[PDB]
Amino acid sequence: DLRPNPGANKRRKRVGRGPGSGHGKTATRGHKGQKSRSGGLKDPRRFEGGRSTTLMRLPKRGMQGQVPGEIKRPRYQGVNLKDLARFEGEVTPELLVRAGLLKKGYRLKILGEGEAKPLKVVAHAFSKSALEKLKAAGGEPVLLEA
Amino acid sequence: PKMKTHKGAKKRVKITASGKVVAMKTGKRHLNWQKSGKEIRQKGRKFVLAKPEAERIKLLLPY
Amino acid sequence: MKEVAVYQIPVLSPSGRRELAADLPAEINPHLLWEVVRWQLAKRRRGTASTKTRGEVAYSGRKIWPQKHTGRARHGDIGAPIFVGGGVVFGPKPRDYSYTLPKKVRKKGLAMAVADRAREGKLLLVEAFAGVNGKTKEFLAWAKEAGLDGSESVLLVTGNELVRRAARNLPWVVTLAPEGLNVYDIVRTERLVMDLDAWEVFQNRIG
Amino acid sequence: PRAKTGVVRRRKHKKILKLAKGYWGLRSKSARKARETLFAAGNYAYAHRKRRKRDFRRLWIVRINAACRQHGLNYSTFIHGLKKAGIEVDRKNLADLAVREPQVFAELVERAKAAQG
RNA sequence: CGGGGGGAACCUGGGGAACUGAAACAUCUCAGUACCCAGAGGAGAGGAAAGAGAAAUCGACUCCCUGAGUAGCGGCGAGCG
RNA sequence: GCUGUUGGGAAGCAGCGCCAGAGAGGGUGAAAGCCCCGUAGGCGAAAGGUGGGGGGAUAGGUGAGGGUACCCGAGUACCCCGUGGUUCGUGGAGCCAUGGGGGAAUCUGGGCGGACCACCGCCUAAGGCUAAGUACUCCGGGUGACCGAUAGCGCACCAGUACCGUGAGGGAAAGGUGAAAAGAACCCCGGGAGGGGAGUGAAAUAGAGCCUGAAACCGUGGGCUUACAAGCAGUCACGGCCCCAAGGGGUUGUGGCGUGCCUAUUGAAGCAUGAGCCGGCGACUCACGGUCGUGGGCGAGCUUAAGCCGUUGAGGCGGAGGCGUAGGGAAACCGAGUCCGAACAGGGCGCGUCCGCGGCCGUGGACCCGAAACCGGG
RNA sequence: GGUGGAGCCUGGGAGUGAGGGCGCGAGCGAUAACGUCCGCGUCCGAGCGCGGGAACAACCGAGACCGCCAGCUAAGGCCCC
RNA sequence: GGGAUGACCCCAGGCGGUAGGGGAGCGUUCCCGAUGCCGAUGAAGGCCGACCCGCGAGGGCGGCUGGAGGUAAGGGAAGUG
RNA sequence: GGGGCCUGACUGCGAGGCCUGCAAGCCGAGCAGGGGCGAAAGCCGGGCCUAGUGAACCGGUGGUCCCGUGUGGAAGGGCCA
């Protein structure tokens, strides 16, 4: 290939916005006209008025956490038998981490959408539904863990 | 250098799968004494509008 | 596919013809090639430019004159950026211009870069190097027989350190180990010459 | 890297000092008394072109009037004539016929008052 | 025999602010920061479990990346973490 | 690596060669791989430093059962009071540390696993030492999409100086002849300072704070022009005179028109702010997060961090981890559903990533200059 | 009916949040004020660019992309300036 | 609307403007382009120009000075007017 | 206005609208539970209507499918009122 015009295509635009001249964004600088466009202003997102944000709303999202922090408890990850359809033989956790879902996220639970497939399928649980669909050839390796 | 989540909202407003912002109806934590069964009942959750754009921007890491 | 590279006479055995995939004229994406070169030359940047804020300037903080009924203008310390002695405002600090380009985009670029070059008719991978004990003399002679006249610039990749010493000092040839294969060095050069062992590793570096 | 002003300012300034040739005093010497002056000069010119176009309408009229006043009637009436006669021609510019070739003017007047009996 | 005093930063320890932020302010923040003192050295500190924490678990200490702006802390404010 | 050619001067230009593990870079009268200093590549320490990296040599370390129950760090543990540290702000408040009071035991000993009890488990306090992987840059060296004398350190220069202040302390300015000094003998005017000749030089309007030498500012000469006109100083028109040519350039006599610039304001020629003029210096940024947009790569996937190897302006490797692939519910949980509810009522919520670029936002002065003041140590 | 620098929807970036006069309609005021407070309209603001009004932000005329030594009108004018 | 898309020609509207929003350019320092190309038959910078191209920011060309450096097309970065 | 039986001054929900910068404020047919009055058609989720009101935070009570820092329980939280 040549040397010049490998050149950036279509739209790179590194032409950012400077404000200093008679034409463009002049005098007071491309915005501002007033006081509190000057080297800091309060937020907004949350702030201001000095009204009450809306922190008049209320934290019913109760169960916010006690001192020594979280409780370790075994956490479960969903995956649809739809997603399983892909591959054949026998499916197990970690076999799944080496793909889209589960990854490290611990205790596998197969459930839900799509038609089931003839393969034994190790899991920590199922939805009732997915246990039923998986009657169409396939597993009840459940129980697990020790 | 890395934004912090604004705990005061995390603590009081869910973010839906659309990305609407959901808050409990205000106004029945002690008011009551006798407001209609309709009043005290009619407090499950709700949307907000334009003010959620703001509330979202603060739950920045949790998306 | 259009894909017929150019064997080079190992011993007397004339120029056969190796040929391989969209590794040969696939379809060149200039923008990407550009993104890669861009990446290559920014990560190599040093970014050792620095300058002193008003804060970092030697002058003390004493107020310079009252503020009030002088008759001169208002001022704090003489280190302020309206002051000649003073600090520079948003001057450069030292920073890092590197950034992590998608590896895949690098494979692509590298694959393509050669391809353009293959399509041009410039890619010639060889085998013969009786041009030994890396003497510029020896290489040059060898080059003559290979039709490498020095009328265009040439990128030579090979693991053989003696042929590397051989060119190098030639000013129309850019010498290179195969792990150093890269678009910029490819592109800057007019003609591309590879060891078959170098073409083997280049194979591995894609797929 | 650092990009000092270098050469650039001196030039915007003597671009403008060229434009200021012949202005009184500092207006031709000060980087910026020149500048000021030249805004105003610029506006003057623009409006003054507009005016030039009216300044001559005016001149022509007044010597047209003069000349056709020499043959009894006046400019109000004379233009009526030309108007009716269909000779929207004259074009006050070209009733310099008043001066070079009054002969021709004389006629024009005659035709004019003929549309008016 | 040792000591003493010096040393650009860097380290440990003993003491330890305020403007500031909270759009006032006292709890809170700035911040164990700035600064003062003592000490150490080419580094200093730490270091071989009366540890972690829920794993038939791991196995000195230090440093980097993660974990995570998570767990929590908080005039449940600002913010801290 | 020589010659030839212009030039004061070749390294330019030309002819014909050569070296190259050396075609980095500087200098030489200009622009040189082959003239010089170098570069690639390779040598070198008597002396004094450094030195398990490779050797040696010590100190040192090398068992089973079966019994006794003799020892397993004390004002210590432990508890209470008062506090500190930890993410923990008295909280349900453990753990670690301890100023005060009370005050054990030696393996049935004792601390801990977040008040506390009971199981189950972890560890052996009240003695000490321990490299390396980590920080920093007075100092030596290497690099630069770092500065180039109002910049870069305050300091390119005899600067922490001159100067200022009792003192702590404060703190400047100021670089450049030329290839070579060949730095102008001697004559002339002058007291000298300065000139004028002569002379050197490629050049002296390169002549010594001497390269380049902009503007303000001050002169001299020349053209046009003005002593009965009134003005933001210009402008439009005519006409005259002056200078190279059917076209210009300069100037301005009379005519028409005409309330400076910036800021701040409902509103400024304004008798509201700023500004003597000229030159230089002087203000919307960068890091990390975020959020839109956009150029691309791959796609139910995308992507790697620290590091490790390779390069010596070469790129690789590295999946810990991170987003996305599922939602609802405070939670237990259930799941294409789920939450409230007795409910086969109702109703609420329920379908990409990586890199570049740009707009904007949060955290850091965060567009630049300015306080009155508060605190610490002097 | 109406294709308009109309409308509606989703998102990025704002500035403004100090108005002024005139007419009409009310309040306050004294059927005072270049007064003051609303309402409908309009212009100045940002149209101190152009014509009229002697001069003059907002009364009359009229929305200035550039050029002309062409023409027709607006308000207002036609004894001289 | 053509459409031998020619970014070249017809047809129709619009083009005052402060805060602001958007869009296209110009120029300065530095980087690749460069072991290249321009330079003593004269670089950069400076003094003129009634000449040429550009709406403009600017770009050339011509003379004078200056005496050794400068740097395309096409990209990239910022102590950029 | 007077009398009779009554407790709908309900619990679980709410199509749909008023109002509206937000957050509040207001009306609501109809379905289920279990009732009241009426022979029935029907009516009843306080009062002829428009004032008698106070977001969150922090606590207190009474309940309760929930959480319970190795396990079982506590301590303490959440949920409803």
Curated annotation (Swiss-Prot), chain A:
Pfam families per UniProt: Ribosomal_L27A
Which domain of life does the protein's organism represent? Answer: Bacteria
Which keywords annotate this record? Ribonucleoprotein, Ribosomal protein, RNA-binding, rRNA-binding
- Please name the NCBIfam families in this protein's record: rplO_bact
Family per record: Belongs to the universal ribosomal protein uL15 family.
Role noted for this protein: Binds to the 23S rRNA.
> How is this protein named in the record?
Large ribosomal subunit protein uL15
Native species: Thermus thermophilus (strain ATCC 27634 / DSM 579 / HB8)
UniProtKB/Swiss-Prot annotation, chain B:
A single GO BP: translation
Q: Which GO terms describe its cellular component?
A: cytosolic large ribosomal subunit
Which taxonomic lineage does the organism of this UniProt entry have? Bacteria, Thermotogati, Deinococcota, Deinococci, Thermales
Task: State whether it acts alone or in a complex, and with which partners, per the record.
Answer: Part of the 50S ribosomal subunit.
NCBIfam families under this entry? rpmI_bact
Which is a Pfam family this sequence falls into?
A: Ribosomal_L35p
Asked whether the keyword Ribosomal protein is assigned, the reply is yes
Check the record and name the PROSITE patterns matching this protein: RIBOSOMAL_L35
Work out whether the entry's keyword set contains Ribonucleoprotein: yes
Q: Which family does it belong to?
A: Belongs to the bacterial ribosomal protein bL35 family.
Q: Which UniProt keywords apply?
A: Ribonucleoprotein, Ribosomal protein
> GO: which molecular function terms?
structural constituent of ribosome
Q: Which InterPro entries match?
A: Ribosomal_bL35, Ribosomal_bL35-like, Ribosomal_bL35_CS, Ribosomal_bL35_sf
Supply the PANTHER family for this chain: 54S RIBOSOMAL PROTEIN BL35M, LARGE RIBOSOMAL SUBUNIT PROTEIN BL35M
Record's superkingdom? Bacteria
Which first-to-last residue range defines the signal peptide? none
Q: Which SUPFAM superfamilies match?
A: L35p-like (SSF143034)
**By what name is this protein known?**
Large ribosomal subunit protein bL35
UniProtKB/Swiss-Prot annotation, chain C:
Give the record's GO biological process terms.
Answer: translation
- Keyword GTP-binding set for record: no
Is RNA-binding a UniProt keyword of this protein? yes
One GO cellular component, as annotated: ribosome
So which domain of life are we looking at?
Bacteria
What is any Pfam family matched here? Ribosomal_L4
Keyword line: Ribonucleoprotein, Ribosomal protein, RNA-binding, rRNA-binding
Q: What is the effect of changing residue 56 to Q?
A: Restores Ptase activity of hybrid ribosomes to that of pure E.coli ribosomes. Significantly increases binding of a tRNA analog to the P site
**NCBIfam families noted in UniProt:** rplD_bact
Subunit composition and interactions: Part of the 50S ribosomal subunit.
Q: What does this protein do?
A: One of the primary rRNA binding proteins, this protein initially binds near the 5'-end of the 23S rRNA. It is important during the early stages of 50S assembly. It makes multiple contacts with different domains of the 23S rRNA in the assembled 50S subunit and ribosome.
**What's this protein's name?**
Large ribosomal subunit protein uL4
Biological source species: Thermus thermophilus (strain ATCC 27634 / DSM 579 / HB8)
Q: What is the lineage of its organism?
A: Bacteria, Thermotogati, Deinococcota, Deinococci, Thermales
UniProt lists the gene as rplD
Swiss-Prot record, chain D:
InterPro entries attached here?
A: Ribosomal_bL20, RIBOSOMAL_L20_CS, Ribosomal_protein_bL20_C
Entry keyword Transcription regulation: no
Q: Which UniProt keywords apply?
A: Ribonucleoprotein, Ribosomal protein, RNA-binding, rRNA-binding
Q: What is this protein called?
A: Large ribosomal subunit protein bL20
Return one GO MF term: structural constituent of ribosome
Q: Which Gene3D superfamilies match?
A: 6.10.160.10, Ribosomal protein L20
Q: Provide a GO biological process annotation.
A: ribosomal large subunit assembly
Q: What does this protein do?
A: Binds directly to 23S ribosomal RNA and is necessary for the in vitro assembly process of the 50S ribosomal subunit. It is not involved in the protein synthesizing functions of that subunit.
Similarity field? Belongs to the bacterial ribosomal protein bL20 family.
For this record, the Gene Ontology CC terms, alphabetical, are: ribonucleoprotein complex; ribosome
Q: Which Pfam families match?
A: Ribosomal_L20
